[PDB]
Motif scaffolding. Structure first.
Motif, PDB file in Angstrom:
ATOM      1  N   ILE A 108       0.854  -1.185   0.000  1.00 33.85           N
ATOM      2  CA  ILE A 108       0.000   0.000   0.000  1.00 33.85           C
ATOM      3  C   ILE A 108       0.887   1.230   0.000  1.00 33.85           C
ATOM      4  O   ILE A 108       1.819   1.342   0.809  1.00 33.85           O
ATOM      5  CB  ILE A 108      -0.946  -0.002   1.213  1.00 33.85           C
ATOM      6  CG1 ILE A 108      -1.840  -1.233   1.206  1.00 33.85           C
ATOM      7  CG2 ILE A 108      -1.780   1.299   1.292  1.00 33.85           C
ATOM      8  CD1 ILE A 108      -2.556  -1.450   2.514  1.00 33.85           C
ATOM      9  N   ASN A 109       0.588   2.169  -0.889  1.00 29.27           N
ATOM     10  CA  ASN A 109       1.432   3.328  -1.106  1.00 29.27           C
ATOM     11  C   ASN A 109       1.021   4.501  -0.229  1.00 29.27           C
ATOM     12  O   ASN A 109      -0.063   4.530   0.363  1.00 29.27           O
ATOM     13  CB  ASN A 109       1.393   3.740  -2.575  1.00 29.27           C
ATOM     14  CG  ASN A 109       2.280   2.849  -3.430  1.00 29.27           C
ATOM     15  OD1 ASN A 109       3.489   2.857  -3.265  1.00 29.27           O
ATOM     16  ND2 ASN A 109       1.686   2.070  -4.317  1.00 29.27           N
ATOM     17  N   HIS A 110       1.927   5.466  -0.139  1.00 31.54           N
ATOM     18  CA  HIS A 110       1.698   6.678   0.628  1.00 31.54           C
ATOM     19  C   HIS A 110       0.868   7.674  -0.173  1.00 31.54           C
ATOM     20  O   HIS A 110       1.123   7.885  -1.362  1.00 31.54           O
ATOM     21  CB  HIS A 110       3.029   7.330   0.999  1.00 31.54           C
ATOM     22  CG  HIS A 110       2.869   8.729   1.506  1.00 31.54           C
ATOM     23  ND1 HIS A 110       2.373   9.009   2.757  1.00 31.54           N
ATOM     24  CD2 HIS A 110       3.096   9.927   0.915  1.00 31.54           C
ATOM     25  CE1 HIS A 110       2.335  10.321   2.933  1.00 31.54           C
ATOM     26  NE2 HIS A 110       2.764  10.900   1.826  1.00 31.54           N
ATOM     27  N   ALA A 111      -0.116   8.289   0.482  1.00 34.81           N
ATOM     28  CA  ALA A 111      -0.740   9.521   0.011  1.00 34.81           C
ATOM     29  C   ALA A 111      -1.151  10.338   1.230  1.00 34.81           C
ATOM     30  O   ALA A 111      -1.618   9.771   2.225  1.00 34.81           O
ATOM     31  CB  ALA A 111      -1.954   9.260  -0.887  1.00 34.81           C
ATOM     32  N   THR A 112      -0.947  11.666   1.158  1.00 37.73           N
ATOM     33  CA  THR A 112      -1.341  12.541   2.262  1.00 37.73           C
ATOM     34  C   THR A 112      -2.835  12.444   2.518  1.00 37.73           C
ATOM     35  O   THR A 112      -3.281  12.443   3.669  1.00 37.73           O
ATOM     36  CB  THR A 112      -0.955  13.997   1.976  1.00 37.73           C
ATOM     37  OG1 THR A 112      -1.670  14.461   0.828  1.00 37.73           O
ATOM     38  CG2 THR A 112       0.530  14.131   1.719  1.00 37.73           C
TER      39      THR A 112
END
Ligand SMILES: [Zn+2]
Ligand SMILES: [Zn+2]
Ligand SMILES: [Zn+2]
Ligand SMILES: [Zn+2]
Ligand SMILES: [Zn+2]
Ligand SMILES: [Zn+2]
Ligand SMILES: [Zn+2]
Ligand SMILES: [Zn+2]
Lengths: 801, 464
Positions: free
Chosen positions: A611-615
Motif C-alpha cells: 500500500i502506497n503513501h498519500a497525504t
C-alpha cells in the motif's frame, strides 16, 4: 624421559603425514570425479545449424555491424596479418512483454507477526568484524579442523604417560588462560573430567605436551596456527559445556517435573516455541510463560485457595467400583504431579486420568495413592477504594481517565511482566501495573489479582445489542470501553457483545453473525477485504494494492503483518539493505515506540506491505491491543470501490532508525482497472472478471523453524522434545491468542493423537505434564480432562489387538 | 601424447562497439550449443550488452583460413542490456533456443535459426546476472537476479501459462546474486553473489501439469559464507566437488561439502537446516570432535584479477578426455590446468622416491611418449639401475629450482597453496575475461571479454 624439545621434535615428524594424506585425498577425489564425467544428454539426431551459412556481406535498409577477425599461429599467438573486417546484417527482435514492477527478496505471506532473532552485521553493500580478524580466525578454524582428527592417533603413537585427550583437557582447564571460561562451566568440566591429573610425571608430561604442541602448531608469526586449547574445545564432550542454548518437598518434586512446561509454555498461544516473549541481545529468549509470573506456585496456590473456598465412572476398572506390578518412580512422579495439580477438586480426581496415562487399572493407582498418603501443603484463608477514573463493575471510564492512565497510549508503554505479587496492586507493594510507568495501567488477564480484589483489573466491555455494537461512534449511549482503550474485545471478558463467537476464526465468514454484535474483533476474526496486487497509479512507485471489492467507510481492511524486530536489528537491517548510503529503501513500521518494537515486511508480511503513501489516504492504520499482543489494523476512511487503489498517510510510522541514532550525538473477481494486476506469487498478469487468486498461506517453513528451535535445547531430553514438538506443530497452526478457544483445540489434539500418545509411555507422561501445567493455571476446564481420560482409555483399548 | 595437448590461440575477433564512448562494450557470456549430434560443427553464442553473436567453428588445414563464421546475429531491439545466456530447445520442434537475460529482469527466448522471439519469461524483480540450463532436462532453466532470488523456469508445453515452477527464496541470500549452477543430476543448485554466501539447494520434482504458483523453497540444504572472504561471482559443481571464485582473492577454490554425495537420495525441503543460531555462518543438512562442514581442497592460482568481479571460469569435463580448467584474468592472460597432470605427477614422484631408495641413487629418468618402454630401457642396463619414466610435459638428478617449479604447478599437498597454471597464454592489448566456453569435443576454447573481444583457442588442429 620426555622434554618439550623431544615432544616438539616428535610432533613435527608426525605432522609430515598431514600434507601427504591431503595430496592423497585430493588426488583420490579428482580421479573419482574424472571417472564420473557425464555423457551428453538430449542430443538431436540432426545438426540444427547445418543449413545456416555465413552471413558476411559480399543489403538495403538493413542494420549492419562490423567484425574484425585476426588469425594466429605458433606458441606465442602472433597474428598472421593485421586483420580482415566484415559487415553482417542484424536481425532485430523486440520482447513481447514488460518486466513486472521491481522488488527485492521473495515476498511471503504470514498469517500473524513472527518474532525475529537478532542478526550479525556481516555484509554491507558497497559492530562489524574487522576483515583482518575475519580472515585470520577463519584461517585458524580451518587448520584446527584439519589437525583435530590427528590428535588421538598421535597421542596413541607417542604413548606418553598422562598425555591423554582427557588429561590435556584437564590441564587446559587448570591454566590461567581459563580469561575464556565462566563459573558453572568449570563445574561441568569438573563434573566430566575433575582436576586430578595423575602422578607428578603425568602432570609434567601434559604440561610439556601442551607447550610443545603450541610451539609446533601455534607459531605466532603464521596465519594458519592453532593452539592445543582450540583443538580441545572442539571435543564433543567439551563443546556442549560452552553452549548457551538452555531452556531451564512434594512440591519441589512437582515443580522440577513440570519445569519445561512452566518455562516454555506460552501464556497466550500455548505453544512452547512461538512468536511471543522477549529476545535478548545474544538471542537467549525469555518466554511469555508461567516463569514470567513467578513459576507454578503462586498460580497453583491460588487455585487451591479458590478450591478450598468452594461424572460417570471410567471404563478402566474404576476405583469407584473397586480400590483393590511394581511402580516405576516415573510412574509415582506422574501420580504426584497430577495429584498436586488436580488439587482440592470436587468434580475431578487423578486416579482415572493417571490410569489412562499409565497402562494401569484405575483401582491400581488408587491403591498406590492410598499407600502413598500424599498431602498437599496447607493454604491460608483487603478492602480497596475504587478508582475515580475507572469503574470495573459498570465497565466504564469516567472523569480525566485519559490523563490518569496510559493504558490506551501504546506508544509510551513499556512491557513489564504481569502482576505476581501477594498484596494489593499499589506502589507500596511493588506492583508494576500501578507504578512501573509514568501512570498506572489496568491489570490484565495474566495478572494474578482477581477483579474482586483489584480496582485496576480490566473486566471487558458491557456492550450488548441485537444490532451492531462495540463501534467507534457508539449510538448506544454508553461507549465501548474496549474501543476507548484502543483494544479489541476479549472473547472471555466481553460477554454481552458476542465477541466470544465473532473473535473465533472458525466463524470468520459467517456474514450473518458479523452483521450484528461486536464490531471490535476484526483482527481476531482474521478476515481481510478482497485486495489485489498491481502496478501503482503513482509514477515512481512500483507496486500498489487495489480493492477487489467495495469497502464502506469504517470497515476493517487488512492487517499490517511482518517480522517483529528490535531497534538495533532495525539499524542493522537498514545497513544491510543499503539504505544508510542514500532515497528511502527500508520501511520499519513502529509498533511500540517506547518499548522498541518495529514490524518489518521486507520479506515476510502480507499484501498490506504494497500500500502506497498519500497525504489524503482512503485507509487509516491504528495500533491495537489484542489479548496482550499489539497489532496494526487498517480501517477505511472513505467508501472505496472495487478496483480503486488503497493509500494511507505514512506520517511518522516508518522512522529512519540510523538517522535518528546519528542525530543523538457474489464471487470474488479480478476487478477492472487501467493498471496491470499480478498474482503475488507467480507474478502472472491477472485479467478482469477472472476469479481472484486466494492462495492458502504456506506455513510449513515456519513450523520447521519452531520445531528446530526446540531440538536445539541441550537442556531437554529426547522424550520431552518429541512431545513438545508434536503439541507445538499442532497448536501453532491454530494461532491462539485467547484461552476461550484452548479447550476445543486441546480435545481435538487428544483425539487426533490418541493412538500416537498411547503407543509410547513417555508421550502420555509428557502429555500429563502439559495437562498438569494447564490445570494449575486453571486454563483447562476439568470437564476436558475427564473426556481426555475416555479418549485415551479407548485408544489403549483399541490397541490391545 | 595427443591427450596431453593444451590449446593455443588460433583466432581473435572484435565485434563493433554496441554500447556507444567508443570501446566500453563487452562480451559478458559465451555458451556452446550442447544438443548437436556427436561430431557436428560446434556452435557458440557470444552475448554482448545488445547482441547475440552466433558462430560456427570448423577446423582448417590452412593456418591463414578463418575457422570462425558468424551464422546469426541478433539484436535485442528493446531497452534491456544483457549479460547472461543459456541454451534450450523447442519442446515440439527440437529447434535451438537461446535465452538472453539482462538488466530489466526478463529472459528473452530466441528462436535463433528463424530469427524471431519464442517467448519472454517475466517475474524477476531486478536485473538478471546469470542463467543455467539443467543437464537432466533441457527445458528447465535457472536465473539468478538482483532481486536476490533464483527462479526456476520450465519451457515444457504443460507449463506454458505459468512457466515459473520454483522460487529459491527465504533468507538464505541477502543481496544481488551473480552466479547460478546445476549439478549434473539437475536436482542440486548452487547460487552465490555479493552477500558472499554460497548456497546449495535441492529441487523437488515438478509435476507434468500446469502449476498455478511456483513451489517456494525457503531453506538451502548447505549454506556458507566462510569459503571466501569477499563477494562470490562464479560457482559450479565439478562432479560432486565445488569450484568457486571471489573478488580480491586471485584463486579458484576447489572444495567439498562434507557428507554430500549425489548417489544418496535427494533430501526433501523439510530436511534442510534452519538458522536457529545466528552466529553460525555455515550450516548443513549433509554433515556426517566437531571439525567441519566443508573442506578446502585446492586453490588454482589466478593472479591479476585486481578488484574486478563478474569473471567466470569453465571446466571441460567429458568421458574419456582430460578435465581442463580454463579462466582468463584482468590483465591479458588466459590460464589452463589439465587436472589429469596432477595424478601423473604424483605417480612420477612416487616412482622416483621408490627407486631412489631401492637403488640408493642409481636411477635413470627417461621421457615417456617415445618408442622406448619400461622394458627396452631396462634391457639397456639390468637389475643394478632403476629406470623411472617421466611425463614428457614435465620439463626441467633434478635441480631444486626444477623440482620447485613442478611442485608449484602439480603438488596438491597444501589446501591454501597456490597452484600455478599449467599453461599461461598472453593476450595482445588490455583485456579482462568475462567467460569461457568449450566445444563438445574439447578442441575449441573461447574466451570473451571487454572491448567486445573473443579469443579462440584450438588444439588437435588440422593445419598443414
Ligand atoms: Zn506464544
Ligand atoms: Zn477410574
Ligand atoms: Zn499488581
Ligand atoms: Zn497487574
Ligand atoms: Zn491488580
Ligand atoms: Zn464493547
Ligand atoms: Zn469489549
Ligand atoms: Zn465487543
Amino acid at each position: 624421559e620426555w622434554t618439550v624439545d623431544k615432544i616438539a621434535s616428535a610432533l613435527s615428524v608426525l605432522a609430515e603425514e598431514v600434507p601427504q594424506n591431503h595430496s592423497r585425498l585430493v588426488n583420490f577425489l579428482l580421479e573419482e570425479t574424472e571417472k564420473r564425467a557425464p555423457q551428453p544428454r538430449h542430443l538431436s539426431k540432426t545438426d540444427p545449424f547445418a543449413h545456416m551459412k555465413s552471413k558476411a556481406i559480399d543489403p538495403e535498409g538493413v542494420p549492419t555491424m562490423d567484425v574484425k577477425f585476426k588469425q594466429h599461429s605458433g606458441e606465442y599467438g602472433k597474428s598472421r596479418n593485421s586483420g580482415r573486417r566484415f559487415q553482417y546484417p542484424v536481425v532485430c527482435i523486440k520482447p513481447d512483454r514488460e518486466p513486472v514492477p521491481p522488488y527485492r527478496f521473495h515476498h511471503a505471506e504470514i498469517r500473524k507477526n513472527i518474532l525475529a532473532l537478532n542478526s550479525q552485521l556481516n555484509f554491507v553493500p558497497h559492530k562489524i568484524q574487522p576483515r583482518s580478524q575475519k580472515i585470520a580466525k577463519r584461517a585458524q578454524a580451518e587448520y584446527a579442523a584439519t589437525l583435530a582428527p590427528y590428535l588421538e592417533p598421535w597421542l596413541r603413537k607417542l604413548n606418553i604417560e598422562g598425555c591423554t585427550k582427557s588429561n590435556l583437557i584437564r590441564f587446559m582447564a587448570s591454566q590461567p588462560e581459563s580469561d575464556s571460561m565462566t563459573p558453572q562451566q568449570k563445574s561441568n568440566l569438573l563434573d566430566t573430567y575433575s582436576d586430578d591429573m595423575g602422578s607428578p610425571q603425568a602432570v609434567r608430561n601434559a604440561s610439556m605436551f601442551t607447550e610443545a604442541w603450541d610451539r609446533v602448531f601455534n607459531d605466532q608469526s603464521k596465519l594458519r596456527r592453532v593452539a592445543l586449547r582450540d583443538i580441545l574445545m572442539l571435543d564433543k564432550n567439551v563443546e556442549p559445556i560452552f553452549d548457551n542454548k538452555r531452556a531451564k518437598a512434594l512440591m519441589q518434586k512437582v515443580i522440577d517435573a513440570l519445569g519445561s512446561y512452566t518455562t516454555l509454555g506460552c501464556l497466550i498461544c500455548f505453544s512452547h516455541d512461538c512468536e511471543h516473549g522477549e529476545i535478548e541481545r545474544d538471542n537467549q529468549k525469555r518466554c511469555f510463560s508461567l516463569e514470567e509470573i513467578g513459576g507454578l506456585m503462586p498460580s497453583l496456590r491460588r487455585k487451591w485457595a479458590a478450591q478450598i473456598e468452594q461424572h460417570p465412572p471410567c471404563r478402566n476398572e474404576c476405583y469407584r467400583i473397586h480400590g483393590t506390578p511394581p511402580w516405576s518412580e516415573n510412574e509415582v512422579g506422574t501420580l504426584e504431579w497430577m495429584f498436586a495439580t488436580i488439587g482440592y477438586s470436587q468434580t475431578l480426581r487423578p486416579e482415572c486420568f493417571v490410569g489412562a496415562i499409565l497402562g494401569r487399572p484405575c483401582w491400581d493407582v488408587h491403591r498406590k495413592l492410598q499407600e502413598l498418603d500424599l498431602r498437599l501443603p496447607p493454604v491460608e484463608p483487603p478492602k480497596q477504594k475504587s478508582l475515580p477514573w475507572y469503574d470495573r463493575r459498570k465497565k466504564q471510564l469516567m472523569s480525566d481517565w485519559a490523563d490518569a492512565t496510559i493504558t490506551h497510549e501504546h506508544a509510551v508503554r513499556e512491557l513489564f511482566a504481569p502482576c505476581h505479587h501477594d498484596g494489593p496492586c499499589t506502589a507500596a507493594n511493588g506492583c508494576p501495573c500501578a507504578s512501573a510507568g509514568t501512570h498506572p495501567v489496568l491489570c490484565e488477564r495474566f495478572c494474578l489479582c482477581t477483579a474482586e480484589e483489584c480496582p485496576l483489573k480490566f473486566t471487558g466491555c458491557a456492550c450488548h445489542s441485537s444490532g451492531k455494537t462495540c463501534l467507534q461512534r457508539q449510538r448506544e449511549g454508553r461507549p465501548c470501553i474496549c474501543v476507548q482503550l484502543n483494544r479489541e474485545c476479549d472473547p472471555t471478558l466481553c460477554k454481552g457483545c458476542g465477541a466470544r463467537e465473532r473473535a473465533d476464526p472458525e466463524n470468520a465468514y459467517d456474514e450473518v453473525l458479523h452483521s450484528t454484535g461486536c464490531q471490535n474483533v476484526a483482527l481476531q476474526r482474521g478476515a481481510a477485504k478482497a485486495v489485489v496486487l498491481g502496478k501503482s497509479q503513482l509514477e515512481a512507485c512500483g507496486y500498489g494494492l487495489f480493492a477487489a471489492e467495495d469497502i464502506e467507510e469504517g470497515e476493517f481492511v487488512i492487517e499490517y503483518t511482518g517480522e517483529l524486530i528490535s531497534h538495533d536489528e532495525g539499524v542493522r537491517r537498514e545497513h544491510r539493505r543499503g539504505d544508510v548510503f542514500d532515497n528511502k529503501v527500508s520501511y520499519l513500521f513502529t509498533l511500540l515506540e517506547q518499548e522498541g518494537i518495529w514490524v518489518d515486511a521486507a520479506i515476510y508480511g502480507n499484501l498490506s506491505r504494497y500500500i502506497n503513501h498519500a497525504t489524503d489516504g482512503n485507509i487509516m492504520p491504528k495500533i491495537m491491543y489484542v489479548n496482550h499482543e499489539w497489532r496494526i489494523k487498517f480501517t477505511a476512511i472513505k467508501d472505496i470501490k472495487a478496483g480503486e487503489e488503497l493509500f494511507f498517510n505514512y506520517g511518522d510510522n516508518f522512522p529512519n532508525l540510523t538517522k535518528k541514532l546519528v542525530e543523538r550525538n457474489r464471487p470474488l473477481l479480478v476487478p477492472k482497472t487501467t493498471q496491470p494486476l499480478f498474482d503475488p506469487l507467480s507474478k502472472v498478469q491477472l485479467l478482469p472478471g477472472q476469479p481472484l487468486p486466494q492462495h492458502p498461506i504456506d506455513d510449513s517453513w515456519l513450523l520447521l523453524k519452531h520445531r528446530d528451535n526446540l531440538q536445539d535445547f541441550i537442556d531437554l531430553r529426547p522424550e520431552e522434545k518429541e512431545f513438545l514438538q508434536e503439541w507445538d506443530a499442532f497448536i501453532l497452526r491454530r494461532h491462539i491468542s485467547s484461552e476461550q478457544y484452548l479447550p476445543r483445540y486441546f480435545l481435538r489434539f487428544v483425539r487426533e493423537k490418541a493412538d500416537w500418545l498411547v503407543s509410547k509411555r513417555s508421550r502420555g507422561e509428557e502429555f500429563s505434564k502439559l495437562v498438569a501445567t494447564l490445570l494449575a493455571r486453571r486454563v483447562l476446564p476439568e470437564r476436558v480432562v475427564i473426556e481426555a481420560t475416555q479418549v485415551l482409555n479407548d485408544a489403549r483399548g483399541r490397541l490391545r489387538e | 601424447s595427443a591427450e596431453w595437448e593444451l590449446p593455443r590461440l588460433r583466432t581473435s575477433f572484435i565485434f563493433q562497439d554496441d554500447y556507444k564512448s567508443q570501446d566500453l562494450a563487452e562480451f559478458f557470456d559465451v555458451k556452446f550449443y550442447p544438443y548437436s549430434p556427436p561430431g557436428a560443427p560446434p556452435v557458440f553464442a557470444a552475448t554482448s550488452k545488445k547482441h547475440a553473436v552466433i558462430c560456427r567453428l570448423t577446423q582448417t588445414t590452412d593456418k591463414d583460413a578463418n575457422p570462425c563464421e558468424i551464422i546469426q546475429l541478433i539484436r535485442d531491439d528493446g531497452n534491456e542490456a544483457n549479460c547472461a545466456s543459456c541454451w534450450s530447445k523447442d519442446p515440439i520442434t527440437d529447434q535451438p533456443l537461446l535465452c538472453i537475460a539482462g538488466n530489466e529482469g526478463n529472459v528473452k527466448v530466441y528462436n535463433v535459426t528463424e530469427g524471431k522471439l519464442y517467448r519472454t519469461l517475466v517475474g524477476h524483480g531486478g536485473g538478471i546476472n546469470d542463467l543455467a540450463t539443467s543437464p537432466a532436462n533441457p527445458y528447465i532453466i535457472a536465473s539468478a537476479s538482483d532481486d536476490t532470488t533464483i527462479r526456476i523456469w520450465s519451457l515444457a508445453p504443460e507449463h506454458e501459462k505459468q512457466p515459473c515452477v520454483c522460487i529459491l527464496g527465504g533468507e538464505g541470500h541477502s543481496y544481488d546474486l551473480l552466479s547460478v549452477a546445476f549439478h549434473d543430476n539437475g536436482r542440486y543448485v548452487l547460487s552465490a553473489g555479493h552477500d558472499q554466501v554460497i548456497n546449495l539447494w535441492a529441487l523437488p520434482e515438478f509435476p507434468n501439469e500446469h502449476m498455478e504458483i511456483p513451489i517456494v523453497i525457503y531453506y538451502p540444504h548447505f549454506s556458507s559464507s566462510e569459503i571466501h572472504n569477499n563477494l562470490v561471482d562464479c560457482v559450479a559443481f565439478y562432479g560432486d566437488l565445488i569450484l568457486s571464485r571471489a573478488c580480491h582473492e586471485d584463486t579458484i577454490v576447489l572444495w567439498r561439502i562434507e557428507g554430500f554425495s549425489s548417489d544418496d537420495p535427494i533430501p526433501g525441503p523439510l530436511d534442510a537446516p534452519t538458522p536457529t543460531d545466528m552466529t553460525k555462518q555455515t550450516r548443513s543438512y549433509f554433515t556426517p570432535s566437531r571439525p567441519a562442514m566443508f573442506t578446502r581442497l585446492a586453490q588454482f592460482h589466478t593472479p591479476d584479477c585486481g578488484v574486478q568481479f563478474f569473471m567466470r571460469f569453465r571446466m571441460y569435463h567429458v568421458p574419456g578426455k582430460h578435465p581442463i580448467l580454463a579462466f582468463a584474468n584482468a590483465k591479458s592472460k588466459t590460464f589452463f590446468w589439465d587436472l589429469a597432470r596432477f595424478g601423473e605427477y604424483a605417480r612420477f614422484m612416487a616412482d622416483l622416491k621408490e627407486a631412489q631408495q631401492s637403488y640408493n641413487g642409481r636411477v635413470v629418468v627417461v621421457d615417456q611418449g617415445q618408442g622406448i618402454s619400461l622394458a627396452q630401457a631396462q634391457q639397456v642396463h639390468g637389475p643394478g639401475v632403476g629406470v623411472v619414466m617421466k611425463p614428457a610435459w614435465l620439463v626441467p638428478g633434478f635441480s631444486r629450482e626444477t623440482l620447485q617449479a613442478w611442485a608449484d604447478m602439480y603438488d596438491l599437498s597444501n589446501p591454501v597453496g597456490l597452484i600455478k597454471a599449467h599453461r599461461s597464454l598472453a593476450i595482445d592489448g588490455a583485456f579482462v575475461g568475462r567467460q569461457v566456453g568449450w566445444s563438445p569435443e574439447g578442441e575449441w576454447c573461447v574466451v570473451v571479454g571487454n572491448g567486445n573481444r573473443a579469443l579462440i583457442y584450438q588444439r588437435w588442429g588440422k593445419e598443414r
